[PDB]
């Protein structure tokens, strides 16, 4: 859970295919809200616009539910899953019939502010662990 850092926004099963939503969602991973704001303004995809709608309604969410800024805010994971697929019995010649599936997505985009401490030096102190819980909230290479 990261101790109250991220903002998770889900999405409806929108009426488009999952894979093109996954190339346009694998583009904007890791980049902050300004770069995705200018790229998804100009990306030449039809899957671009509900993704930009969910980023916009995700950072406006992050500014109204929480109280953050739209500049120190990077996209955390932005996972796109499968949805419900409709079945369309479409006839074709020599008396055949083909199932044409209408696919839907399931977009869940997580946003991530930097709410940091930015400690002065690195040097380890193996004392007062009930302060070591609070001083270390998000770091790397956890030993013991």
């Amino acid at each position: 859970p990261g101790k109250c850092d991220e903002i998770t926004t889900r999405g409806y099963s929108i009426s488009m295919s999952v894979d093109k939503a996954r190339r346009v969602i694998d583009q904007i991973r890791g980049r902050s809200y300004a770069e995705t704001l200018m790229i998804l303004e100009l990306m030449p995809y039809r899957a671009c616009y509900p993704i930009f709608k969910l980023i916009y309604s995700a950072a406006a969410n992050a500014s109204h539910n929480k109280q953050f800024n739209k500049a120190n805010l990077i996209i955390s994971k932005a996972e796109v899953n499968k949805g419900i697929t409709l079945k369309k019995v479409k006839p074709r010649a020599r008396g055949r019939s083909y199932m044409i599936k209408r696919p839907t997505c399931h977009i869940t985009i997580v946003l991530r502010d930097i709410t940091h401490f930015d400690s002065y030096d690195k040097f380890l102190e193996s004392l007062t662990p009930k302060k070591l819980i609070a001083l270390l909230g998000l770091m790397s290479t956890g030993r013991r």
């Binding site: 894979d19 996954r22 190339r23 346009v24 694998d26 200018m38 790229i39 100009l42 990306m43 030449p44």
Partner: protein, 46 residues
Amino acid sequence: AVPKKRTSIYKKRIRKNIWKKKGYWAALKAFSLAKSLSTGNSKSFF
């Protein structure tokens, strides 16, 4: 013409990720156009 067997998860994730990496290559171009669309004297985009 008719395929003899099916592909693995292996080869399919290779080909789909080449397709989506081919989608990755056409947005740093869009980042460059979106960055040149910003404040500056450019004789385009009326």
